[PDB]
């Protein structure tokens, strides 16, 4: 019914107006969002320098404000600031291009809706698995009728969604493991007008996953891709052959 | 052997070149970071605009860059622009301020650690557990026996280690698991001087962990925290509820 709507590429982003708009139908939705484009802006926060918001117009079915913040510093201006820390729901994205695997700790469209899951408010991360050519609108439609089949009782304590919606045909969804796929990087070296080297990153995918029912796998087989994450990084099983050992 | 010491703080930090120094009396050692202090970086990386590197001098014994980029950014540099993808230990920190529970996520510290992770380098992030009155070179100290009694086989793929350190007296170290240490956060507002008003964000600590063997606990009993991450959130236990009701 509250719902808190967020994004890393901006507020001006088509993929965070059209999801607002769609969700303002039926429920009650607040946009707050970065004013600037952000991009492997990861799970960053303002504690160092004040932050600022300035009203602005998306509906006058929505309530909306850039601030000078992150993904995450939204929330707890969203939070505190601006809705009387009262949210049944927040949804941050609709970002243009996936957000899988080892991808998810850099990502700012997580991060946003990570920071609700630690304060344990259910939180939904949506994204478009297209860069090129983003389907902002069947995302959020997509969402739309997702949220009418999911209980939100089940998703644990400190847990939100990570979404990841193929562009073109949907065939349907699957509840999705993290994948391991990640990056083989390097840098492109350039030299300025002044004479100095720069260097552009650039990398080549690696998607080795053995396993069936992870992230990339659902999207590449034209379904939404679904994973239940939390800010628990222990490796349980590593700690447990550790202390068997010393 | 070969080791990359990295940072948060920046390459001026007290806290980067102790590390340095005492590593190089026995191992090769690099030192890429960040040319200026950094906070709640979190695991950002820098892809929409060229990265710079600058020669600094901390020794005539290792050899230190500073970059125009994050701790990932500077990982992501030495290995493939300075050590010819040659590595045999990543080292980030000796961070003034701890980094537990939920912070971890925010921590550029980590981060720097974590980039060495996903590349499946063994890496360890380490910090000094009191921002008032850091003790660098105990946790550097510490960090130097630890690693003469350390099995890095036993650190599996994709894993790192969090060290905390207690500035005073280190009554020994545990093996620990991650806390939902966490905080209460709010904001003081404030007006500027052409009347727009502005927020510090400020907070009160959350800890309320049932089990004994987290991170903060070990840290305020004195001992040094040892935790062994990943970059993998699924919340597994979620997953199986979910797919055993869907």
Chains 1, 2 share one sequence.
Not at 26 to 45: L, Q
Not at 229 to 245: A, G, S, Y
């Amino acid at each position: 019914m509250r719902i808190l709507v967020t994004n890393d590429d901006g507020i001006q982003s088509k993929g965070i107006i059209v999801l607002a708009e769609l969700l303002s139908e039926e429920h009650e939705v607040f946009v707050v969002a970065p004013d600037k484009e952000r991009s492997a802006t990861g799970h960053s926060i303002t504690i160092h320098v004040p932050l600022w918001m300035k009203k602005v117009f998306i509906s006058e079915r929505v309530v909306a404000y850039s601030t000078t913040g992150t993904p995450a510093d939204c929330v707890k201006l969203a939070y505190n600031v601006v809705m009387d820390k009262r949210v049944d729901l927040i949804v941050s994205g609709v970002n243009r291009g996936p957000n899988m695997g080892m991808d998810i700790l850099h990502s700012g469209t997580v991060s946003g809706a990570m920071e609700g899951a630690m304060m344990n408010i259910p939180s939904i991360a949506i994204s478009s698995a297209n860069y090129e050519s983003p389907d902002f609108e069947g995302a959020a439609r997509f969402l739309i009728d997702f949220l009418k089949e999911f209980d939100f009782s089940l998703l644990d304590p400190f847990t939100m969604l990570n979404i990841n919606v193929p562009a073109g045909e949907i065939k349907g969804w699957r509840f999705t493991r993290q994948s391991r796929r990640r990056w083989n990087d390097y840098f492109e070296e350039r030299v300025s007008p002044f004479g100095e080297k720069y260097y552009w990153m650039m990398g080549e995918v690696i998607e080795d996953d053995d396993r069936d029912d992870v992230d990339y796998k659902a999207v590449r087989e034209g379904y939404v891709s679904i994973t239940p994450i939390h800010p628990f990084l222990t490796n349980e099983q590593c700690l447990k052959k550790l202390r068997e050992v010393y």
